[PDB]
Each structure stands twice: as C-alpha cells, then as structure tokens.
From Swiss-Prot:
This is Calcium-binding protein 4. Phosphorylated. Phosphorylation levels change with the light conditions and regulate the activity, but has no effect on calcium binding. The chain holds residues 200 to 271 of 271 of the full protein. The gene is Cabp4. Ca(2+) 2 binds at residues 16, 18, 20, 22, 27. Interacts with CACNA1F and CACNA1D (via IQ domain) in a calcium independent manner. Interacts (via N-terminus) with UNC119. It is found in: Cytoplasm; Presynapse.
Length: 72
C-alpha cells in the first residue's frame, strides 16, 4: 500500500498545474496564496524556496520536495 508518499504527492501535485514534476516559484505562488487566501510575501517566497532546494536551482522536484518533507 502507500508507505507515506501519499501526502508528499498531494502537496507536490497540488501546487503543480502540469503534473510535469516541477513547482517553480511560479507554481508555488499560484498555490501558496490559496493557503491563506492571500500571498504572504515576495521575499518570503524566494526565501523559503532557497530553503526547499537541495541544489539551489530555483525549482522543486519530488526528489527535492520529498527529501525535505520526508524528514522536515
Ligand atoms: Ca509545473
Ligand atoms: Ca531545485
């Protein structure tokens, strides 16, 4: 059955509007506002983004998104 990637999927796949497997600051900004009806901030994003990356590329990959959440 599902070991736990379920949540990991629902989140990545959520902010992803192409199921391509990549949530660029763009997708995160198109999915982060709904979390609060309003876009928290701008530098607040790029900041968290820089922290959600493991290669500093500016994009989220399941391998990147997971490695982070998988342990947080
Ligand atoms: Ca995408
Ligand atoms: Ca990255």
């Amino acid at each position: 059955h599902m070991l736990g990637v379920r949540e990991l999927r629902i989140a990545f796949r959520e902010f992803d509007k192409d199921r391509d497997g990549r949530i660029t600051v763009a997708e995160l900004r198109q999915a982060a506002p709904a979390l609060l009806g309003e876009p928290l901030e701008g530098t607040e994003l790029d900041e968290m983004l820089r922290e959600m990356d493991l290669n500093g590329d500016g994009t989220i990959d399941f391998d990147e998104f997971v490695m982070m959440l998988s342990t947080g």
